[PDB]
Design a protein around this ligand. Structure first.
Ligand SMILES: Nc1ncnc2c1ncn2[C@@H]1O[C@H](COP(=O)(O)OP(=O)(O)OC[C@H]2O[C@@H]([n+]3ccc4cc[nH]c(=O)c4c3)[C@H](O)[C@@H]2O)[C@@H](O)[C@H]1O
Length: 140
């Protein structure tokens, strides 16, 4: 099963999420990203199970990436669902910051405010190899 689950917004973080996947695979990690490894069935259950299976949870924080989580108290938003699963399961969460502004915790549903307390990594377009090496140091 995968070592790393990559959670991202399709409309803003797709390219970086894919780039992270390639690099982490090149360094010997098994990576889950939906477009490569989610297969048939009811996707809600399968995605949650895939988060539970991976030791590491890499969260691509592109600009505005938590906006649709705001006021999503029924937890229908998919990035919200994935984050809550990673937090609940005690995963090694590794936020990747690419143009993201840290929100105040109180604008987020209580079940995911803790994601802001994890040490994040800034994506550097000018120093990508060094960014990748730091991500690998954060992985368990
Ligand atoms: N029956 C359907 N079969 C196929 N596609 C469908 C279906 N119904 C809607 N869609 C279209 O699937 C796209 C994404 O949906 P969306 O809600 O926009 O996604 P987010 O970018 O908010 O959040 C992305 C993060 O959540 C996970 N994710 C979220 C949702 C899905 C749904 C299906 N399969 C996935 O693989 C998947 C992955 C992923 O692991 C990321 O980390 C849009 O084109 C939807 O029309």
């Amino acid at each position: 099963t995968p070592d790393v689950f990559i959670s991202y917004r399709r409309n803003s973080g797709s390219q970086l999420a894919s780039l992270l996947k390639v690099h982490l695979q090149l360094h010997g990690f098994s990576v889950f990203i939906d477009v490569e490894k989610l297969e048939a069935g009811k996707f809600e259950d399968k995605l949650i199970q895939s988060v539970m299976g991976a030791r590491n949870f890499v969260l691509v924080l592109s600009p505005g990436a938590l906006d649709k989580c705001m006021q999503d108290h029924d937890c229908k938003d998919w990035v919200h669902k994935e984050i809550v699963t990673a937090l609940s399961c005690g995963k090694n969460i590794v936020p990747i910051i690419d143009g993201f502004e840290w929100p105040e915790p109180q604008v987020l549903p209580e079940d995911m405010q803790a994601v802001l307390t994890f040490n994040g990594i800034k994506w550097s377009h000018e120093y990508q190899e060094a960014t990748i090496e730091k991500i690998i140091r954060f992985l368990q």
